[PDB]
């Protein structure tokens, strides 16, 4: 089967705008996409080639003094498929052009700095695509749910995040923020599937069952986070993810459309080609 | 799925009788299929690589000390970055530690040559990939030639001890040199000049590599004589046919992982009880 492209851009239908509410989102929908799974798998393979070309241009431009770069931020509940999306996106790219960080629980060194210190260290360099599997937002989600910071601190964190994203954008970074949204039942279906497949027992974590008890608090944290931190220069996008195939192509199209907005082309030679060709031909 | 007739660990290995001069960079040793067959074998190899790497990692997470280090050396133009790209893309990047070694920083030049290499070796459960490596330090551009040959000899020996320690710690070391002809190198440079989308990539440096081509070939031969050991053999991969180099490198890697006898870890808890507990949440 052949590539059915998005009918409407996900920068548009998946954006968190002034209207937004996270309960209006259906985790089963495929917004902007009129094809089905077979069509999506075929789009995905085309997307990969497109992404490889456009990242390679970002990189080439960066090697020649362009300051532009890109930062993909993924947040989602466990099971929602961040790992798989990260792996897919990174694997479509040249790894020497990508800076992936999967933020784990903070180290003691990290806990003794402001919450952005560890994040700022990892922002992508010129010409790079940075991928954040989890991000600075962890510090207004898990911490909120579990009362590990008061309404005041949370408020300051929201403002710091926005100031941070604003600094990065001014320095050249296009920030693509994605939340992968699965339903509370989809998570259950997924944890059960880990227990039913022996190949997946090594991944099962009791910790994921623990936190189901806090599921609606997490949805609230997210929704507040989006009211606070979805801006014109760094919009949030919430991508229905109950269908893995759809989330993959929605994340990828977001990336391609962000990269296509940068007007990347291949650098001209900084030397004389005709002459250099002759030198090689005599080499 | 046309597979390897003979395993590349046999036919591509650097043993007792070895001569770089006798390697034909246009051959496809151990393989009897043609481009279209190699291209489908690769597609198959990717899925196998994904599974074996994930098993390596799962075992590591549960306290297995086994890991893998792929070391790739090659002249520029020879496909090394491309192959690294493809092999890493077949794996989950959180299970991979890729380092592309460049010219030493001043901090690095003030330590022994291995200090910086040591920093980057893979953890338990990880596949490490070295795009260039410790071998660069016994090639011509960081030697003062053989004016102090004692230093060089020291280095080959350092490299063996290092690879011996890593293997004692649990690393399977897979070492590959991609080998192209001098004429193929010319062809690929010229192609870089004839394709405006590759201009960014062209380096006058590589034309200098041409002048000293035979000298690089000799440095690699001495390297293979001195550091192809039983625990860390060298393999030389004809690479004028990119498609073959790709399937040879992965196959080396598949075979090495395959020899570690990996499986998925067993759950250390009552699966049935937990499932019930999940069902009631």
Automatic annotation (TrEMBL), chain A:
SUPFAM superfamilies: P-loop containing nucleoside triphosphate hydrolases (SSF52540). GO terms for biological process: polyphosphate metabolic process. It comes from the Bacteria. Keywords: Kinase, Transferase. It holds the Pfam family PPK2. Residues 37-259 form the Polyphosphate kinase-2-related domain. One of its GO terms (molecular function) is polyphosphate kinase activity. NCBIfam families: PPK2_rel_1. This is Polyphosphate kinase 2 family protein.
